[PDB]
Amino acid sequence: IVLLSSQLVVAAFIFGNTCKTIFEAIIFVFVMHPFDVGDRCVIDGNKMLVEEMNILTTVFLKWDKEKVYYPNSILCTKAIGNFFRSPDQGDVLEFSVDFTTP
Amino acid sequence: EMNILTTVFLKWDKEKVYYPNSILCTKAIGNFFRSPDQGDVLEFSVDFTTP
Amino acid sequence: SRFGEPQTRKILEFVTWTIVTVLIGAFLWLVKTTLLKILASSFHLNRFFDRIQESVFHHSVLQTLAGAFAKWVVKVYNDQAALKHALNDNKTAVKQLNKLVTAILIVMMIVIWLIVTGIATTKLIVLLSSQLVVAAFIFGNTCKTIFEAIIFVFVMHPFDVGDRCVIDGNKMLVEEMNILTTVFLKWDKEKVYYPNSILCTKAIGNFFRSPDQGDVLEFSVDFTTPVLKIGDLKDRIKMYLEQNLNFWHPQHNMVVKEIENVNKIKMALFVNHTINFQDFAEKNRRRSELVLELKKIFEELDIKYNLLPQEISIRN
Amino acid sequence: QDFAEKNRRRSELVLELKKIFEELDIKYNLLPQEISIRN
Amino acid sequence: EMNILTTVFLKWDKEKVYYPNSILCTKAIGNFFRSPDQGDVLEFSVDFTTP
Amino acid sequence: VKVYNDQAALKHALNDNKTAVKQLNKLVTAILIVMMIVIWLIVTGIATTKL
Numbered sequence A: 001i002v003l004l005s006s007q008l009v010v011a012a013f014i015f016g017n018t019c020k021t022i023f024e025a026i027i028f029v030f031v032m033h034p035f036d037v038g039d040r041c042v043i044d045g046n047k048m049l050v051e052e053m054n055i056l057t058t059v060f061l062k063w064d065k066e067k068v069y070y071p072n073s074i075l076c077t078k079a080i081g082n083f084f085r086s087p088d089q090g091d092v093l094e095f096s097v098d099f100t101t102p
Numbered sequence B, E: 001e002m003n004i005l006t007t008v009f010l011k012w013d014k015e016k017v018y019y020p021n022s023i024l025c026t027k028a029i030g031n032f033f034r035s036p037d038q039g040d041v042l043e044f045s046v047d048f049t050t051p
Numbered sequence C: 001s002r003f004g005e006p007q008t009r010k011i012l013e014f015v016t017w018t019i020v021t022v023l024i025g026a027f028l029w030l031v032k033t034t035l036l037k038i039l040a041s042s043f044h045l046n047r048f049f050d051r052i053q054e055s056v057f058h059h060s061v062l063q064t065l066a067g068a069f070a071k072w073v074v075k076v077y078n079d080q081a082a083l084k085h086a087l088n089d090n091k092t093a094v095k096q097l098n099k100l101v102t103a104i105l106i107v108m109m110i111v112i113w114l115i116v117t118g119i120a121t122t123k124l125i126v127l128l129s130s131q132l133v134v135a136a137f138i139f140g141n142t143c144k145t146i147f148e149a150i151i152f153v154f155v156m157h158p159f160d161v162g163d164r165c166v167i168d169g170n171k172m173l174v175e176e177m178n179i180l181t182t183v184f185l186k187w188d189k190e191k192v193y194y195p196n197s198i199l200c201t202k203a204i205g206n207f208f209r210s211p212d213q214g215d216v217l218e219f220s221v222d223f224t225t226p227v228l229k230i231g232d233l234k235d236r237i238k239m240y241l242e243q244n245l246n247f248w249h250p251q252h253n254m255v256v257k258e259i260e261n262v263n264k265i266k267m268a269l270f271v272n273h274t275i276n277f278q279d280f281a282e283k284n285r286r287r288s289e290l291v292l293e294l295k296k297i298f299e300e301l302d303i304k305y306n307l308l309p310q311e312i313s314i315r316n
Numbered sequence D: 001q002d003f004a005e006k007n008r009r010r011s012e013l014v015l016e017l018k019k020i021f022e023e024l025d026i027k028y029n030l031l032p033q034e035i036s037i038r039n
Numbered sequence F: 001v002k003v004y005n006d007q008a009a010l011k012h013a014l015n016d017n018k019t020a021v022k023q024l025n026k027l028v029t030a031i032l033i034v035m036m037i038v039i040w041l042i043v044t045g046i047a048t049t050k051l
């Protein structure tokens, strides 16, 4: 019994960090829950559609439908926009005219 | 809205943004609500020869 | 490259414990074997079973035929090769995992035997304990790295061998997969060794696994272009796309984006290809023809862009 | 959530702005350049 | 030359450069020697009115 | 004389890619010697347990 417990401690020392990552990803997916499948999200300015959610990764489609795999261990530290959940959105048209325009 | 793990914000165009508190807490945050009357600037230029 | 190429009392106590240790060993052996079999199988069985069956079908057909055709025949052989390479790399990776695990299993069993049997004495236990602690630091990052690499390769599995992937804007073909590295070919066929410990933190694109992809043609026209010519441009583009349905889906959008000064209107044409971008050269050939069609339409409709006029004052 | 639709609506607004500038005769001009000629 | 702690490289102008292996271990490394025949690109532009 | 000069050039060209192995050998050996000192101290019983 002692020997078994001793090795669990060693394994923790060595692999605890990967277990930590998996757990953090679980919290991101089930507790924070920033998006669902089919939502358009904005990550680093990229407007992407969520195709699939998993524990370790999120699969998105870019505007040109390239499939992209993001580790959840990375998404956990980003600010994520979600258009699906947004209220009516606004916009801007910028332009310029001559100084002398009455 | 506010929560323990994440703060939710709306941008000027109203997209909804989920922003983890674990990153937000290491940033400097301005707050216009709590601010006193604020100031502003108009920059412009004129010709050198203007008297 | 594979792709892209042109005192019987004490004696019995001893024996009893030796037998127990041996059984522990067998148990762990069984566990080890089982986990590797699961990993090795599920990796492919639940992902490309169907590609294997397609390959078998086409070869059955070729054998039958023997009793753009050439382009088809070549594609059939290239796809079979890709599956063979994926299969061999998986077998290799699993064998490498097998060696790492077998070796640690053997070592721990030696230690277990020595201590449960009473052979190791207090001083030996102290030294073994220290050796393990020191090793824990030295090989600490290595063990972590290998573990993460295993999860990346077998669990996350963002790409297979032969897939055209996009990493940090670099469109690269996967040549080989291993536990510590992935080998990629760049568009100019430079061979790149890319560590998995880095690749594990990136967003990785995969064209092979993508649905039909879209594209954009951006352009500008003069601000004075009559709205009627803008309407004719939209109509002419629609007719072009509808006459080439082997290349383009009927759905497209013309977006007017911006008015700069009162001189320029910025526009973009959004189109949809009938292919994904695994064949990059083919994508560019189809796009190239669309760009030349846009050229032709502008000439026929007399769509122009002029620079703003400059007023000049002359002193002597 | 639907970008193609957003852009269609925005495009019509951009073209309306174009139309208004033309009808109201709103322009932009470059600053005049004085030239001295030494032949 | 290659050693355990460092790799020594020559730049195009033959400057001798010493890299810690500890930093090379985290880089993507191209290898021309091991590459298949390589390709290239010539970019250019022409007038819009070119027939 | 050309044959012997070419032989020397080739032996060096081949030995140049094995320098890392020679370095590893020295490292491993140093470790091995230390391990054997410790083994000697323990197996002969000369060392005591407090030390």
Ligand SMILES: CCCCCCCCCCCCCCCC(=O)O
Pocket: A018, A019, A022, A023, A054, A055, A056, A057, C151, C155, C156, C157
């Ligand atoms: C606490 C960690 C121990 C378990 C280690 C095994 C890896 C975590 C479980 C993987 C679940 C499947 C993840 C999604 C895979 C996919 O992208 O299809």
Ligand SMILES: CCCCCCCCCCCCCCCC(=O)O
Pocket: A027, A031, A032, B003, B004, B005, B006
């Ligand atoms: C590792 C454990 C994490 C869970 C402990 C924190 C509890 C959740 C904190 C709020 C963020 C998620 C919002 C859920 C909706 C709600 O309950 O209001």
Ligand SMILES: CCCCCCCCCCCCCCCC(=O)O
Pocket: C096, C100, C142, C146, C178, C179, C180, C181
């Ligand atoms: C770090 C400890 C060893 C890891 C397990 C064995 C090696 C795993 C596979 C990585 C690639 C090494 C083999 C190919 C080398 C080559 O390119 O010739």
Ligand SMILES: CCCCCCCCCCCCCCCC(=O)O
Pocket: E003, E004, E005, E006, F023, F024, F026, F027, F030
């Ligand atoms: C024996 C421990 C020494 C500590 C340094 C660890 C590496 C072992 C020594 C081998 C030499 C490493 C390369 C340095 C360059 C050279 O040898 O010229």
